[PDB]
């Protein structure tokens, strides 16, 4: 059941160098007298690892919740075995299952449960002089446990219930690693007689257990036994004591290692391949010794930093202002059409104008048409009542749709409209606008009908002059300025887009970035797409030529669409790294050559040599570098 621990005086956690520590047997395979390469989660060599304390001098003890990352390397130098085990999980709060280890002299209890872990998880351990023993008085680790799914008891560990002193005579160290719902554990124990810290020498952890737990892990926390000694009040204001233990945490990560297995089937030495250039050389040769010489070992390669895209100036804008800002619009029965072709259409000036009362598009979203292309666009335009703007859409009906202007049911254009009673309304009405009130039949899509002859309303066969059942087919609108909004004039434009087998000629504008030079960049010049270093040029193309090619028929120059300048393209496709070694019998220092790159360091014909001094004194060649240049080990 849960309690708290006093919030405290403390110091920040320290760091220490891991040296060679934290190697473990990757596989249950016997291999003897052999060097084997493997890519696995390891603690990389010489890593700084966090050092934590558990000391009552004041009151600095350091068991936060910590990340698990890819996996944990843990170590302890021994005390009262103050570390009792660990909890691992995600939410820790019963609602997600978590793994508990507790490592008691009675039982190594291993449990997965819906543990409700505390504000401060610990074992309350009291010196029961009542019965001449220390004992746990209190499981202050959790409030409740439920749905456990797994439990195990292993044999009582090399760790004890009493206020003992291992006094750093032993180093206990572990790897914890969760993969595919299998929680692996590894460990080793080792006598030490250093003062403190991780020792230099090599050792391998053996497998300790694997638990098929399946549960989510993200975080962990170390569990401590806290000394409610008889001098303490036995409360949680101050009725506890921390002892004086120390523990270390490092993290695994993906690394390639080379392991030396001896005759007895034991790992005895290792190389972290990614550490330094000699480690990469040993890992390349699959050997722990390297003879005097030069070894090709890796490839250098530069990556593009930016993408530029660049297209000719935006200039030939389509005539929309001549349609929308026109002075005289048509009567709807005799609607105008204008045909738009061979231009850059910037629809943005339409679709985010605030002026229009209606704006909507069918088969196309405004979020796409500024990057779309068409053979032609038609703009149809006319004036109608505010009510009738409803009917200018697919599948509509009534006098305007059926006798004046019919859209296809599968239309792919836009309808735009705005109120006007300024251009096109005055006292007595402007009667200059008309519509068909009568026809024998409905229009087909985009039909027009200017025909002006008397509509015979069925009965009374009519000899071409108006009368009863025989009406003139057009009516004129009463566009008074004081009309209600449904009877105000509205100017309308319908933009119909189309595609045929003819090439596209109306298209949205193309954006250009700035033009950048002397960096490796990705680029797109007017559709010509690539990656390289752009620089000015001495080439002289003919006025119509756009890009150059070499004798191998690959692109080596280009013209800028917006300034007509010629640019050379050069590849950043470098290669080759080599390590120069006096032999490991002689020394562990090395020099490195980058095979052909503009940068001690020392540029040469054969690329830039790094890490060795150039010297004017000639000698015979110890190790050959490039173009009459050699390297040697000297005072």
């Amino acid at each position, epitope marked *: 059941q849960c309690v708290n621990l006093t919030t405290r005086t403390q110091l920040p956690p320290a760091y220490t160098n891991s040296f060679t520590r934290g190697v473990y047997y990757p596989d249950k395979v016997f291999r003897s007298s052999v060097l084997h390469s493997t890519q696995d989660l390891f603690l990389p060599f010489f890593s700084n690892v966090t050092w934590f304390h558990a000391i009552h001098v004041t009151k600095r003890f350091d068991n936060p919740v910590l990340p698990f990352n890819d996996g944990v390397y843990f170590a302890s130098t021994e005390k009262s075995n103050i570390i009792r085990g660990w909890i691992f999980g995600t939410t820790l709060d019963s609602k997600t299952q978590s793994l508990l280890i507790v490592n008691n002299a009675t039982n190594v209890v291993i449990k997965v449960c819906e543990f409700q872990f505390c504000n401060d998880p610990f074992l309350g351990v009291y010196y029961h002089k009542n019965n001449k023993s220390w004992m746990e008085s209190e499981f202050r680790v959790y409030s409740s446990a439920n749905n456990c799914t797994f439990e195990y008891v292993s044999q009582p560990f090399l760790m004890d219930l009493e206020g003992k002193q291992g006094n750093f005579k032993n180093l206990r160290e572990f790897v914890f690693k969760n993969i595919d719902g299998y929680f692996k554990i590894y460990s080793k124990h080792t006598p030490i007689n250093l003062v403190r810290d991780l020792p230099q020498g090599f050792s391998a952890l053996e497998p300790l257990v694997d638990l098929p737990i399946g549960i989510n892990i993200t975080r962990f926390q170390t569990l401590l036994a806290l000394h409610r000694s008889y001098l303490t009040p036995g409360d949680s204001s101050s009725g506890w004591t921390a002892g004086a233990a120390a523990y270390y945490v490092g993290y695994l990560q993906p690394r390639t290692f080379l392991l030396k297995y001896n005759e007895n089937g034991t790992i005895t030495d290792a190389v972290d391949c990614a550490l330094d250039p000699l480690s990469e050389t040993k890992c390349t040769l699959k050997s722990f010794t390297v003879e005097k010489g030069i070894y090709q070992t890796s490839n250098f390669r530069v990556q593009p930093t930016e993408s530029i895209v660049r297209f000719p100036n935006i200039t030939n804008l389509c005539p929309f202002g001549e349609v929308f800002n026109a002075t005289r619009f048509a009567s709807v029965y005799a609607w105008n059409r204008k045909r738009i072709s061979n231009c850059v259409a910037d629809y*943005s000036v339409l*679709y*985010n*104008s*605030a002026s229009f*009362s*209606t*704006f*909507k598009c069918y088969g196309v*979203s*405004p*979020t796409k048409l500024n990057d779309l292309c068409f053979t032609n666009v038609y703009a149809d335009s006319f004036v109608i009542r505010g009510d009738e*703007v*409803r009917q200018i*859409a697919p599948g*509509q009906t009534g006098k305007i749709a059926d006798y004046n202007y019919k859209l296809p049911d599968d239309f792919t254009g836009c309808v735009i409209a705005w109120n006007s009673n300024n251009l096109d309304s005055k006292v007595g009405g402007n009667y200059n606008y008309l519509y068909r009130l009568f026809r024998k039949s409905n229009l087909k899509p985009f039909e027009r009908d200017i025909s002006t002859e008397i509509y015979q309303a069925g009965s009374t066969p009519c000899n071409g002059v108006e009368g009863f059942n025989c009406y003139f087919p057009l009516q004129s609108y009463g566009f008074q300025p004081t009309n209600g909004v449904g009877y105000q004039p509205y100017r309308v434009v319908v933009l119909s887009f189309e595609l045929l087998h003819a090439p596209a000629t109306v298209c949205g504008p193309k954006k250009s970035t700035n033009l950048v030079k002397n960096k490796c960049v990705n680029f797109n010049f007017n559709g010509l797409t690539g990656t390289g270093v752009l620089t000015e040029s001495n080439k002289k193309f003919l006025p119509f030529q756009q890009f150059g090619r070499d004798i191998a028929d690959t692109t080596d120059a280009v013209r800028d669409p917006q300034t007509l300048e010629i640019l050379d393209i050069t590849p950043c496709s470098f290669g080759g790294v080599s390590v120069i070694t006096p032999g490991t019998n002689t020394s562990n220092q090395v020099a490195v050559l980058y095979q052909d790159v503009n940068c001690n360091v020392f540029q040469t014909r054969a690329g830039c040599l790094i890490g060795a001094e150039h010297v004017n004194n000639s000698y015979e060649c110890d190790i050959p570098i490039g173009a009459g240049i050699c390297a040697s080990y000297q005072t």
Partner: antibody
Amino acid sequence: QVQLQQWGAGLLKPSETLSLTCAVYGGSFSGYYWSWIRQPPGKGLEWIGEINHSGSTNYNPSLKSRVTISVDTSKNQFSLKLSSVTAADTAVYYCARRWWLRGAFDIWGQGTTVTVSS
Amino acid sequence: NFMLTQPHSVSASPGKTVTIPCTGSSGNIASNYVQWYQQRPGSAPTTVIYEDNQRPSGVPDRFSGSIDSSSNSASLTISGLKTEDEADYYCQSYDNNIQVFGGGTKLTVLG
């Protein structure tokens, strides 16, 4: 992709001035409509006002009298001031993007609570 | 000026289908695009219909928009209700340099 993160003074008292900032990651102010919307506790959304593409401003006539909205492109940040606050200004406030004048509220800031209390 | 109105609440049993109406008033709803946002409690809204018929990427095809100028109304149909559909739904549209929202409808799936 684009993120909006917002912050400001969540607790006020009557007749003070409210002030929020919203800042954009992975995107740029210039091309889009940027807008403030509020939601009183257990009530429908109310649109306050907006910046258009290129940074001119438009406000709801019911709040026009006591609202101000402004950008600093050097921070990728924009902001709302609402003066003379009363209990009725208690709400959650969101910033949001719109691609074009009549288009959707495309992406939203995480929302921030404001309590105006004496 | 122009207002969208919605029923305050809607409910039906899971696996069934419902319509939420959004009625235009003082102007014509068909004249500009309509959007529907879902807000699940304690979070920012999200779009489910982004022009009168159009459904965003990743939105279940259970969600389906519609409009008619004859009722002066839009409506959202959710077909095959699930536990996760229980939320507020707001319609929205541009009017006259103003974005207008409906009052929002609570949908519950009738467990």
